[PDB]
Amino acid sequence: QNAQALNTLVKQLSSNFGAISSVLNDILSRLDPPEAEVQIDRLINGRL
Amino acid sequence: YNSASFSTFKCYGVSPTKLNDLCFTNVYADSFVIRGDEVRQIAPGQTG
């Protein structure tokens, strides 16, 4: 059960939660702050 | 991006000043002519 919990927590890191991508570098390298901030907001909510 | 006498220079999902820092699989180019009032219809989610 402990192993399953940890594995699920790890696997939840690849979701998009509605953002364009699940990689922070792929977002920073393509956008200005005013929209990267929105994408980061969505990602932050999901991971929290 | 630096050339003047351009009515519109607008990018969706990409920061224009960052375009020199990215690599792509391939690039398409689409060319045509329309009226001045019709230029707003060229947009994602736009209706016309």
UniProtKB/Swiss-Prot annotation, chain B:
Q: What's the stated role of this polypeptide?
A: Attaches the virion to the cell membrane by interacting with host receptor, initiating the infection. The major receptor is host ACE2. When S2/S2' has been cleaved, binding to the receptor triggers direct fusion at the cell membrane. When S2/S2' has not been cleaved, binding to the receptor results in internalization of the virus by endocytosis using host TFRC and GRM2 and leading to fusion of the virion membrane with the host endosomal membrane. Alternatively, may use NRP1/NRP2 and integrin as entry receptors.
Which consequence is recorded for altering D37N? In strain: Omicron/BA.2, Omicron/BA.2.12.1, Omicron/BA.2.75, Omicron/BA.4, Omicron/BA.5, Omicron/BQ.1.1, Omicron/XBB.1.5, Omicron/EG.5.1; complete loss of interaction with host integrins
Assembly notes:
Binds to host ACE2. RBD also interacts with the N-linked glycan on 'Asn-90' of ACE2. Cleavage of S generates a polybasic C-terminal sequence on S1 that binds to host Neuropilin-1 (NRP1) and Neuropilin-2 (NRP2) receptors. Interacts with host integrin alpha-5/beta-1 (ITGA5:ITGB1) and with ACE2 in complex with integrin alpha-5/beta-1 (ITGA5:ITGB1). May interact via cytoplasmic c-terminus with M protein. May interact (via N-terminus) with host bilirubin and biliverdin, thereby preventing antibody binding to the SARS-CoV-2 spike NTD via an allosteric mechanism.
Q: Known consequence of changing S3F?
A: In strain: Omicron/BA.2, Omicron/BA.2.12.1, Omicron/BA.2.75, Omicron/BA.4, Omicron/BA.5, Omicron/BQ.1.1, Omicron/XBB.1.5, Omicron/EG.5.1
Q: Under what name is this protein listed?
A: Spike protein S1
Which residue ranges are recorded for the region named Integrin-binding motif?
35-37
Question: Which start and end residues of the full protein are shown?
Answer: 369 to 416 of 1273
